[PDB]
Amino acid sequence: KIEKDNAFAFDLLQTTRKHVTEANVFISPLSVSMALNMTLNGAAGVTADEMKTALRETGYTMEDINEYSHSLREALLKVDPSTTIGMANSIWYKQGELVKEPFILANRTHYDAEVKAVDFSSPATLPAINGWCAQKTNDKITKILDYIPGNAFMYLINAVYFKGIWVTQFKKSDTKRAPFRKADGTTQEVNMMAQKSTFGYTTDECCQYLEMDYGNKAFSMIVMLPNEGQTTRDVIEQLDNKHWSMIIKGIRPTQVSLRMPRFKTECKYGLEKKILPEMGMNVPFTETADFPGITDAAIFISRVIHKTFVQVDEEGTEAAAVTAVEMVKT
């Protein structure tokens, strides 16, 4: 049994925030870890060690990583029948290529991976792959790929889906037009939801913290609201396992007058460019990568595409993420 914490989530958030310039950031560390853990089953030597370093899995064996992911995925799918949860994995590879059975069977066994041999040159393949993504995200992420390169060898794709209903919903009749001050200091008018209810609450030097439950209270949203003059950049930079543990343990049921905007965001990342290299994953993205667990062919990771969606409203939250690890032949 491995006691894996949320270090990867905080490191991925911090590194993504450092490199992207957009006002909004929205990621699924779970989706990224699951797709890269499928891929890691084929890696040897420094390729494998650099992937474990980036994933914050150094010192864990592949057997323990696989068994942890398998147990985690099954627990998330059954902990709350009143919340919709989707966890789907698929492997798509070039028809006619030989892919090793221990690698495929490790992924079928521990990730319930759907495995398909496809002709990447067919006009039908992009709709088949993108159609799978739409099917596993309630059509909220309808494309993960815009093109397939000529040297494509394999896609390892994960889709995470979430649709929760607030334990205490907002009344649509209580939503009002109100200002929201943007990251650049300018103001926009938004649909500000409001309610007075019992919520989990705590504070520290920087911020106020709120916990809003969904369904049977297995899942919740944590909101970190910096005090006046404080920034979200500082909150992100100072967020680690120690700090998160202190926030969670400090939460107490409190009567709160909540004001929250209706909001939606859709984000797209190429994690191979700067983020995963900074986290320690370098060699797997180069021609010196070694994936002998997958094939005898010389392959490497060309892109790690991460796309997300979130919509928050009076009823609850809908969120989705897709991560595609694109492997190409050198």
Partner 1 sequence: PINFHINKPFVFAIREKSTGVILFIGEIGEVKE
Binding site for partner 1 (CB under 8 A): 5-6, 9, 13, 17, 23-30, 72, 75-76, 79, 160, 162, 164, 178-184, 188, 190-192, 196, 199, 201, 208, 210, 217-226, 231-232, 235-236, 239, 248, 254-265, 267, 308, 310, 317, 319, 321
DSSP assignment letter at 214: B
Per the listing, tokens 């709160």 go with 256
Q: Which residue, among 184, 157, 141, 182, has the nearest Cα to 39 in the 3D structure?
A: 157
d(CA 43, CA 37): 10
Confirm if 133 and 143 have CB atoms less than 8 A apart. Answer: yes
Closer to Cl ion by CB, 217 or 233: give it: 233
The interface partner of residue 274, options being partner 1, Cl ion, K ion, none and the CB cut-off 5 to 8 Å by kind, is: K ion
Closer to partner 1 by CB, 20 or 62: give it: 20
Angle at 151 between CA 147 and CA 153, to 5 degrees: 90
DSSP string covering 129-161? HHHHHHHTTTTSS--S-S---TTEEEEEEEEEE
Q: Which stretch binds K ion (CB under 5 A): 48-56, 62-70, 221-229, 272-280?
A: 272-280
Bridge partners of 274, per DSSP, are: none
Q: At what angle do helices 62-78 and 101-111 cross, to 10 degrees?
A: 30
Closer to K ion by CB, 113 or 279: give it: 279
- Regarding 17 and contact with K ion (CB under 5 A), the answer is no
Closer to K ion by CB, 193 or 271: give it: 271
The residue count of the chain comes to 330
Task: Tell which one of 162, 269, 291, 300 touches Cl ion (CB under 5 A).
Answer: 269
d(CA 164, CA 118): 35
d(CA 313, CA 174): 12
Give the x/- contact pattern for Cl ion in 31-70, rule: CB under 5 A: ----------------------------------------
The interface partner of residue 126, options being K ion, partner 1, Cl ion, none and the CB cut-off 5 to 8 Å by kind, is: none
Confirm if 68 and 142 have CB atoms less than 8 A apart. Answer: no
Instruction: Please report how close the Cβ of residue 266 comes to Cl ion at its closest, in angstroms.
Output: 14
DSSP string covering 107-124? HHHHH--EEEEE-TTSTT
Instruction: Please report how close the Cβ of residue 306 comes to Cl ion at its closest, in angstroms.
Output: 8
Instruction: Please report how close the Cβ of residue 163 comes to Cl ion at its closest, in angstroms.
Output: 26
Q: What residues line the site for Cl ion (CB under 5 A)?
A: 269-270
Q: What residues line the site for K ion (CB under 5 A)?
A: 19, 273-274
Annotated binding-site ranges for Zn(2+): 70, 110
